[PDB]
């Protein structure tokens, strides 16, 4: 049947978009995007794979490219995901000083009320080859 539980829980940031053969992976102690709305312990999280399509009657597709959104550790009430838990399209990331405890309190963002932040990485940290961020540009 349909599912419509009252749990919106939207990622704070815009999508990362892949163009390549890899899916997405960040090295140890790195990968956490600039969280302007979080404490230094709150930085811990993961990126969640996402795509979006619709069903046109005549088979029409939207076919948005593979994307990733950043989500904080333990977002979603019954998510059942501790840090490092293996799940499809899930890559755990943390930085120094980040605490291994849940912080669902950040992911209560409503996209109807606020706009997502352009995903950025901190100074000295670069996206892997073939990845770019939604709403981000270079130059200017």
From Swiss-Prot:
The keyword Repeat does not apply. Changing residue 40 to R: In strain: Gamma/P.1. The modification Phosphoserine is found at residue 136. Homodimer, homotetramer, homooligomer with RNA. Both monomeric and oligomeric forms interact with RNA. Interacts with protein M. Interacts with protein E. Interacts with NSP3; this interaction serves to tether the genome to the newly translated replicase-transcriptase complex at a very early stage of infection. Interacts with host NLRP3 and ABHD8; these interactions disrupt the association between NLRP3 and ABHD8, increasing NLRP3 stability, ultimately leading to increased inflammasome activation. Residues 8-134 form the CoV N NTD domain. GO terms for cellular component: cytoplasm; extracellular region; host cell endoplasmic reticulum-Golgi intermediate compartment; host cell Golgi apparatus; host cell perinuclear region of cytoplasm; host extracellular space; intracellular membraneless organelle; MHC class I protein complex. One of its GO terms (molecular function) is RNA stem-loop binding. Keywords: Acetylation, ADP-ribosylation, Host cytoplasm, Phosphoprotein, Ribonucleoprotein, RNA-binding, Secreted, Transcription, Transcription regulation, Viral nucleoprotein, Virion. Belongs to the betacoronavirus nucleocapsid protein family. The keyword Secreted applies. Changing residue 123 to A: Partial loss of RNA-binding. One of its GO terms (biological process) is viral RNA genome packaging. It is found in: Virion; Host cytoplasm; Secreted; Host extracellular space. Residues 23-43 are annotated as: Disordered. Changing residue 111 to S: In strain: Omicron/BA.4. The chain holds residues 44 to 180 of 419 of the full protein. Its main location: virion. RNA binds at residues 52, 67, 109. This is Nucleoprotein.
């Amino acid at each position: 049947g349909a599912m419509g539980l009252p749990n919106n829980t939207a990622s704070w940031f815009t999508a990362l978009t892949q163009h390549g053969k890899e899916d997405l992976k960040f090295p140890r102690g790195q990968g956490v995007p600039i969280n302007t709305n979080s404490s230094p312990d709150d930085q811990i999280g993961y990126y969640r794979r996402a795509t979006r399509r619709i069903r046109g009657g005549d088979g029409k597709m939207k076919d948005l490219s593979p994307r990733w959104y950043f989500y904080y550790l333990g977002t979603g009430p019954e998510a059942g995901l501790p840090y490092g838990a293996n799940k499809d399209g899930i890559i755990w990331v943390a930085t120094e000083g980040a605490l291994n405890t849940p912080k669902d309190h950040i992911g209560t963002r409503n996209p109807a009320n606020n706009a997502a932040i352009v995903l950025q990485l901190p100074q000295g940290t670069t996206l892997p080859k073939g990845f770019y961020a939604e709403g981000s540009r270079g130059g200017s």
